[PDB]
Amino acid sequence: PSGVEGAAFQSRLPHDRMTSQEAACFPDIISGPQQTQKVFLFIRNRTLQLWLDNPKIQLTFEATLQQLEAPYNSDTVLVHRVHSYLERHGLINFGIYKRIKPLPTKKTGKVIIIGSGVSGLAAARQLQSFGMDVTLLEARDRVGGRVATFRKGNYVADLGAMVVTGLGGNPMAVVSKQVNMELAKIKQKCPLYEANGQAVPKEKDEMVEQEFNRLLEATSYLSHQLDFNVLNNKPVSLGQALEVVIQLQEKHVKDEQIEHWKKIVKTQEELKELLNKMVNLKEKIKELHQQYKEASEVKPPRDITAEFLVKSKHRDLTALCKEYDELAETQGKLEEKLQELEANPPSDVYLSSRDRQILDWHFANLEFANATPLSTLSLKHWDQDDDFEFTGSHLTVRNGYSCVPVALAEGLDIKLNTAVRQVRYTASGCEVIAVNTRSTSQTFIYKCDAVLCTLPLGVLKQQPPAVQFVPPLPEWKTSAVQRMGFGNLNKVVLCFDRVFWDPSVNLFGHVGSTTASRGELFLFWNLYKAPILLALVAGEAAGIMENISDDVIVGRCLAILKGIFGSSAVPQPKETVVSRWRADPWARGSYSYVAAGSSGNDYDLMAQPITPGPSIPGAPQPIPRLFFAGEHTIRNYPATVHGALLSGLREAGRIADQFLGAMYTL
Amino acid sequence: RKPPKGMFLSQEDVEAVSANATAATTVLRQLDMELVSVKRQIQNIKQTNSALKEKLDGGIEPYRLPEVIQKCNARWTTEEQLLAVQAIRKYGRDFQAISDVIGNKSVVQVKNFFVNYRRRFNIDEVLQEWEAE
Ligand SMILES: CNC(=O)c1cccc([C@@H]2C[C@@H](O)N3c4cc(C)c(C)cc4N(C[C@H](O)[C@H](O)[C@H](O)COP(=O)(O)OP(=O)(O)OC[C@H]4O[C@@H](n5cnc6c(N)ncnc65)[C@H](O)[C@@H]4O)C4=NC(=O)NC(=O)[C@@]423)c1
Numbered sequence: 001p002s003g004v005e006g007a008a009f010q011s012r013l014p015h016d017r018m019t020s021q022e023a024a025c026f027p028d029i030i031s032g033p034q035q036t037q038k039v040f041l042f043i044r045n046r047t048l049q050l051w052l053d054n055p056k057i058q059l060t061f062e063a064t065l066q067q068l069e070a071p072y073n074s075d076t077v078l079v080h081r082v083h084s085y086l087e088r089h090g091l092i093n094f095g096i097y098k099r100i101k102p103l104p105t106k107k108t109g110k111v112i113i114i115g116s117g118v119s120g121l122a123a124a125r126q127l128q129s130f131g132m133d134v135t136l137l138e139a140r141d142r143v144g145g146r147v148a149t150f151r152k153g154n155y156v157a158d159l160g161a162m163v164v165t166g167l168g169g170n171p172m173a174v175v176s177k178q179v180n181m182e183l184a185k186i187k188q189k190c191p192l193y194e195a196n197g198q199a200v201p202k203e204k205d206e207m208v209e210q211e212f213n214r215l216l217e218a219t220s221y222l223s224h225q226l227d228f229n230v231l232n233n234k235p236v237s238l239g240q241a242l243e244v245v246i247q248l249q250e251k252h253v254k255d256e257q258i259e260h261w262k263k264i265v266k267t268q269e270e271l272k273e274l275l276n277k278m279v280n281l282k283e284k285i286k287e288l289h290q291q292y293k294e295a296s297e298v299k300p301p302r303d304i305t306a307e308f309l310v311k312s313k314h315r316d317l318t319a320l321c322k323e324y325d326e327l328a329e330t331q332g333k334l335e336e337k338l339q340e341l342e343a344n345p346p347s348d349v350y351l352s353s354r355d356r357q358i359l360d361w362h363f364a365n366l367e368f369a370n371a372t373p374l375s376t377l378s379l380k381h382w383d384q385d386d387d388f389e390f391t392g393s394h395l396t397v398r399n400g401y402s403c404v405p406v407a408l409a410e411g412l413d414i415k416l417n418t419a420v421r422q423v424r425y426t427a428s429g430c431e432v433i434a435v436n437t438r439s440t441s442q443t444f445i446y447k448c449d450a451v452l453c454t455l456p457l458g459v460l461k462q463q464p465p466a467v468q469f470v471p472p473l474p475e476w477k478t479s480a481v482q483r484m485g486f487g488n489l490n491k492v493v494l495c496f497d498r499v500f501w502d503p504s505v506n507l508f509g510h511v512g513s514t515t516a517s518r519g520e521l522f523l524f525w526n527l528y529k530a531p532i533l534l535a536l537v538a539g540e541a542a543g544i545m546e547n548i549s550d551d552v553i554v555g556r557c558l559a560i561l562k563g564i565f566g567s568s569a570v571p572q573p574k575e576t577v578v579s580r581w582r583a584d585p586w587a588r589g590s591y592s593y594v595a596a597g598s599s600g601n602d603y604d605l606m607a608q609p610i611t612p613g614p615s616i617p618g619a620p621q622p623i624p625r626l627f628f629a630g631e632h633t634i635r636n637y638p639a640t641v642h643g644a645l646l647s648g649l650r651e652a653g654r655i656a657d658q659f660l661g662a663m664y665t666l
Numbered sequence: 667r668k669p670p671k672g673m674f675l676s677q678e679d680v681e682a683v684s685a686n687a688t689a690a691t692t693v694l695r696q697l698d699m700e701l702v703s704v705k706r707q708i709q710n711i712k713q714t715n716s717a718l719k720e721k722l723d724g725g726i727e728p729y730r731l732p733e734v735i736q737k738c739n740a741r742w743t744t745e746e747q748l749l750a751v752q753a754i755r756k757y758g759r760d761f762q763a764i765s766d767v768i769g770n771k772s773v774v775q776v777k778n779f780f781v782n783y784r785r786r787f788n789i790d791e792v793l794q795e796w797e798a799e
C-alpha cells in the first residue's frame with residue numbers, strides 16, 4: 001500500500017472507514033454526512049503520513065496544517081481535533097522523537113508505573129510527554145523486562161525477545177528509524193537433522209511439512225465445521241484435536257486395507273466356485289469320452305439307434321468341451337485381476353515411527369511459537385490473532401534488543417531494585433508500597449493519583465500473591481487471570497571461538513528420539529556477527545529442563561552438535577548462558593497464550609481499569625485509579641513486544657483522557 | 667465447507683474415537699484384527715484353489731474330438747430321418763443340438779422337418795414323451 005492509504009495500513013487502521021475509537025471521539029463526524037466522514041479520513045491519513053515519513057522529530061499541529069491543502073486545510077478545528085486525537089493515543093509522536101515544543105515547566109497529576117518492561121516504558125514516555133509526573137518502579141536491576149540481552153566482550157545474544165515479526169503495520173518500524181537497531185532478515189530455510197546426526201532428505205522433509213500443515217487445517221475443520229469444541233464437559237485443546245485427526249487418518253488407512261483384501265477374497269471365491277465347476281465338468285467330460293469310445297467300438301454297419309448313440313455322445317461331448325473353454329476364458333481373467341489387485345495395494349501405514357518423529361519436530365516448532373504444550377491451547381481460539389499478522393519478513397536484532405528499552409528509558413524516573421509488594425487504591429488516590437530487592441529491609445511508600453500495573457501475567461497469577469491489592473481485585477479480573485495461559489520457553493546461548501556451522505543458514509533443527517522430548521533442544525540460531533549459536537527448549541521440555549544444571553544442559557547441546565557436525569569440529573564453548581523464565585520471579589514464565597477454556601475476551605478483561613468504591617457512603621462514583629498494560633492485555637497482539645508497546649501507548653491515552661481531560665471530543 | 671483433500675473426517679467418525687479414553691485404541695484394534703481375519707482367510711482359499719488347479723492338469727486335451735467340417739445338404743436320407751426322430755426324443759426342441767447330431771442339416775430345415783413330417787413321424791407324442799423326463 002502507498003500514499004495516504006499506506007499511512008493508515010502502517011498504523012493498523014482501515015483507510016476507508018472510521019474505527020470504533022474514532023466514533024467515540026468524533027461522534028459528530030460518524031453520524032454525519034458521508035462526505036464529512038470522508039474529509040476526516042483524509043485528514044487522519046495525511047497526518048499519519050507526515051509522522052511516518054519522519055518520526056525522528058515531533059509533528060506539531062501547526063506543521064501539520066501547513067502541509068495540508070484545501071479544502072482539507074479549511075476547517076482548522078477538525079484538523080486540531082484529529083491531530084490531538086492522534087497525539088493522545090500514540091499514533092503520532094510516540095517513541096523517541098525530538099521535541100519542537102519543550103514540555104511545560106510544571107506537570108499535572110502523579111502516576112506510578114509498576115514495571116519497566118517495554119509496556120511500562122512506552123506509557124511512561126507518553127505520560128511524561130503529556131505533562132504528567134511519572135515514576136516507574138522496577139524489581140530488577142535493569143530496564144527491558146522480558147527484553148533481556150546478554151553481553152560479554154563482543155558477544156551479544158538475546159535471552160528474551162529476539163524477533164521483529166515483520167514491518168508491515170508494525171510500530172517497531174517507527175522505533176527502528178528512531179533507534180539504530182541493526183535489523184537483519186531471517187532466512188526461512190531450516191534443515192532438519194535426526195538424532196542419528198544426518199540430514200533428513202528433501203523427499204521426507206516436504207512430505208512431513210505438508211502433512212503437518214494439512215493436519216492443522218484438519219483441526220480448523222473440526223473446530224468451525226463440526227462444532228467439536230467440547231468433550232466430556234471440558235473445552236477441547238489443540239493437542240486433543242490433533243490426536244483425533246491423526247487417529248482418524250490412521251483409521252482410514254486400516255479401512256482402506258480391509259476394503260482392498262476384501263476385494264481379493266471376493267474374487268478368490270469367485271475363482272473357487274469357478275474351479276469347482278471345472279473339476280465337476282472335466283469329470284463329466286472324462287466319463288462321456290469313455291462312453292463315446294465304447295459306442296464307436298461297435299463295428300459298422302450299425303442299426304440306427306447305435307449310430308444315434310455315437311453321433312449323440314459326440315454332440316454332447318463337444319458341448320461340454322465348449323462350456324469348459326468359456327470357463328477357462330473366464331478363469332484367465334480372474335487370475336489376472338488377482339495380480340492387478342495384489343500388485344496395487346494401498347498404503348501400508350499412515351506414518352512410520354520415523355515420520356512421526358519429524359512430525360513431532362513441526363509440533364515442537366508450534367509449541368515454541370505459542371510457548372506452551374499444544375495440550376493447553378484452546379482449539380477454538382489459539383489462532384484468533386492470525387488475522388492481524390504483519391506483512392513482510394521476520395527480522396533479528398544484531399546488536400541486541402535491549403537497545404530499545406534502554407533507549408525508551410532515556411529521561412525517565414526509574415527506581416531499580418524496587419519490588420512492589422502492595423498496591424493500595426481508594427477514592428482519593430493511591431499508594432504503592434515497595435521494598436529494596438537487596439536488603440528487603442528498606443521500605444518505600446509512593447503516593448499517586450493512578451497506578452499503571454504492567455506486572456507480567458505470571459506474577460499476577462502467583463499463589464501465594466507476590467503483590468497484594470488493597471482492596472482485592474474483583475472476581476471478574478481474578479478469573480481472567482486464572483483462565484488465561486502463561487507459557488514458558490527457554491534459550492541456551494552457546495559462545496564459541498570459531499564458526500563451525502553453515503554461516504548461510506540462520507537456523508537448523510534437531511529431531512527428537514521421542515514425542516515427550518520433542519521440544520528438548522530442537523532448534524538452533526546463527527543470528528549474530530560473533531560465533532554464537534542459540535538453542536531453543538520448547539513445549540513440555542521447557543518446564544522440565546529448568547531442574548537440570550547448566551553443564552548437563554550445555555552437554556546435551558554439544559552432543560547434538562557433534563552428531564550434526566562431527567565430534568572434532570565442535571570446540572568446548574567459551575561462555576554459556578541458560579535462561580529459566582518460569583523460575584525468574586519477575587516473570588514466572590515467558591508470555592501468554594490462549595488457554596483452553598479461555599478466549600480473546602479475557603485479554604480485554606485484563607485491560608479494564610479498576611475503580612474503587614466511595615470513601616464516604618453516598619458519595620459520587622469515583623474515577624478509575626488502577627490501570628493495566630503489558631503483553632497479556634492487548635487482544636489483537638498478545639505475547640509480543642510490539643503488543644506490549646501498543647498496550648502502554650493506549651493506557652497513556654486512557655489515563656490522560658481521565659486526568660488531563662480530552663478537549664478534542666466537542 | 668470441506669476437509670483438506672486426503673484427510674478423512676466425518677461426524678460419525680469423530681464420536682466413535684472420542685467416546686472414551688481408549689475408544690481410539692480399541693477401534694484401531696477391531697481393524698488390526700479384522701485385517702488378520704481376512705488376510706489368512708485369503709491364504710486359505712488361495713490354497714484350496716491351488717489344490718483345484720492340480721486336479722485340472724492337462725486340461726481336457728486327451729478328450730477332445732476333431733471337427734466334423736460337413737457341407738450342409740438339403741435332401742433327407744431315411745438315415746437322416748431316423749436320427750432326427752431320436753434327437754427329438756432326447757433333446758425336445760433344442761434345434762441346435764438336433765442339427766448337430768444329424769450334422770448335414772441346418773437349424774431351419776430342422777424346423778421345416780417338425781412340420782412336413784409331423785403327422786407321419788408322430789412328433790407330438792415324441793415331444794410329450796420327452797417332457798416326461
Ligand atoms: C504468540 N506469540 C507470538 O505471536 C510471537 C510472535 C513473534 C515472536 C515471538 C517471540 C518468541 C520469542 O522469540 N520472543 C520471546 C522470547 C522469550 C524468552 C520471552 C520471555 C518473550 C518473548 N517475546 C514476548 C515479549 O518478550 C514480551 O511479550 C514483552 O516483553 C512483554 O513486556 P511487558 O508486557 O512490558 O512485561 P515485562 O515483563 O517486559 O515487563 C514487566 C516488568 O515488571 C517487572 N516486575 C515484575 N514484578 C515486579 C514487581 N513486583 N515490582 C516491580 N517490578 C516488577 C519485571 O521486572 C519487568 O521489568 C517475544 N515477542 C516478540 O515480539 N519477539 C520475540 O522474539 C518473542 C512470539
Ligand SMILES: [K+]
Nearest residue numbers: 188189190191
Ligand atoms: K522448513
